[PDB]
Amino acid sequence: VDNKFNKERVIAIGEIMRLPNLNSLQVVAFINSLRDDPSQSANLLAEAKKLNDAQAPK
Amino acid sequence: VDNKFNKELGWATWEIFNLPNLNGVQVKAFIDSLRDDPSQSANLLAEAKKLNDAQAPK
Numbered sequence: 880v881d882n883k884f885n886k887e888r889v890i891a892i893g894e895i896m897r898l899p900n901l902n903s904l905q906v907v908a909f910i911n912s913l914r915d916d917p918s919q920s921a922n923l924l925a926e927a928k929k930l931n932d933a934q935a936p937k
Numbered sequence: 938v939d940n941k942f943n944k945e946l947g948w949a950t951w952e953i954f955n956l957p958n959l960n961g962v963q964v965k966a967f968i969d970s971l972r973d974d975p976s977q978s979a980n981l982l983a984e985a986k987k988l989n990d991a992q993a994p995k
Contacts, residue, residue: 893943893947894947896947896978898972907964914954
């Protein structure tokens with residue numbers, strides 16, 4: 880609907896939702912950004928996987 | 938595909954995200970439930986549609 884990223888966006892949303900390190904609100908943060916930019920859904924998702932990584936252990 | 942659940946986990950999250958009657962908490966909860974149980978994402982989406990419908994007019 881929004882673009883060809885409608886398909887791509889859900890995967891990112893799913894990816895945010897996959898990250899067990901992200902906060903629910905943080906996840907919403909990324910989801911909300913997909914809304915803001917479906918083209919860069921992967922970008923903030925990137926931020927999410929990064930955030931997940933940020934909250935992940937080392 | 939193998940990532941169907943992820944795609945759906947992301948989608949159900951979005952569909953719950955896009956529900957016209959859920960509050961920040963219920964949506965966040967459905968997301969929380971989604972992260973906790975992605976296979977249940979449809980169910981959460983279901984719950985959301987139920988919560989949204991419950992919060993929706995008739």
